[PDB]
């Protein structure tokens, strides 16, 4: 089980619920996905070639840059169909509370990416909690020097919800509220 | 398959990080887990031992045992600290809506700990709901001949939430405060 502790928590409440049959199909998804999936060398979203079919599709601003914290963000940006940008999963978030700094979690490859001056927009579209929020402050302050216009997914989600569970009417209405800085 | 939403998203993340070696180990695991997966002999809660690791410490209060709906939320009550008794996982409550009854859930057993056995206080930390309440109620109305003293979890997610949702610091204030009867 080469797996995290509080993960491997929630697969045995899991898996104690679930049919045999079930089970069976997990473990070979387990498998099938050790072998299909991978991370994209440019986003980081899972996908199953080397690069993503947002990415290769050059039918795509990738001028502009959609910053998440997770690939099923990505999926949930998707169901807008208004953007036309491309993304970066960040695969975390800044915790100090998990021990997880910014040189965990995929910030110095998304600067590497504004290197060459091609990159125009960055939006960021981490969740409106603290450690979402904190995220987006220090990348906001990691991108000033350079030239790049850096945005705020406006609120418009909730409290503490989660920006991979909000509907297509809310989403496309907080893409296009964006504030800058 | 068969996992929720953001659990399969870290599991995908660990498989993409081992060996190919070890994920055929943890296929193996996966299976394995489900046949050695149970419900404690004394709390009901998830374990892989005929009789849980906390029922099974002896360092422990087993008088006062506290009442809960669900495994994730012994694990809610454990980030205490302070608490020291044992706990019953009553896997749901009265639900007039879903048609859920006592006899579906894990209210006898609770008795046959009181009667058959020695205890000395029980504390209700179901849910703040009609759901949760009704369930509190049923139970402290079934606990009343026996002499033991029951409380109530007071000042809890104020919603709208679950308990196993909640801050530690809230918990161990709504347990401190825990009133009769
Ligand atoms: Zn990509
Ligand atoms: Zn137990």
Chains 1, 2 share one sequence.
Do not use: W
Not at 130 to 138: D, F, K, R, S, V
Request: hydrophobic content about 40%.
């Amino acid at each position: 089980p080469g797996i995290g502790p509080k993960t491997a928590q929630r697969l045995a409440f899991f898996i104690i619920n679930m049919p045999l049959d079930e089970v069976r199909s997990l473990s070979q998804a387990i498998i099938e996905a050790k072998e299909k999936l991978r991370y994209c060398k440019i986003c980081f979203n899972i996908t199953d070639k080397e690069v993503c079919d947002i990415c290769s599709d050059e039918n795509r601003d990738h001028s502009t840059i959609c910053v998440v914290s997770h690939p099923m963000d990505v999926v949930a940006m998707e169901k807008v169909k208004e953007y036309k940008g491309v993304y970066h999963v960040l695969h975390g978030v800044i915790s100090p509370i998990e021990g997880v700094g910014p040189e965990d979690i995929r910030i110095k490859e998304l600067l590497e990416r504004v290197r060459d001056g091609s990159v125009k927009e960055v939006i960021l579209a981490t969740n409106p909690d603290i450690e979402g929020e904190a995220t987006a402050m220090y990348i906001a302050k990691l991108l000033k020097p350079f030239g790049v216009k850096v945005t705020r997914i406006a609120h418009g989600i909730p409290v503490g919800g989660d920006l991979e569970y909000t509907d297509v009417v809310t989403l496309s209405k907080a893409l296009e509220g964006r504030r800058e800085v």
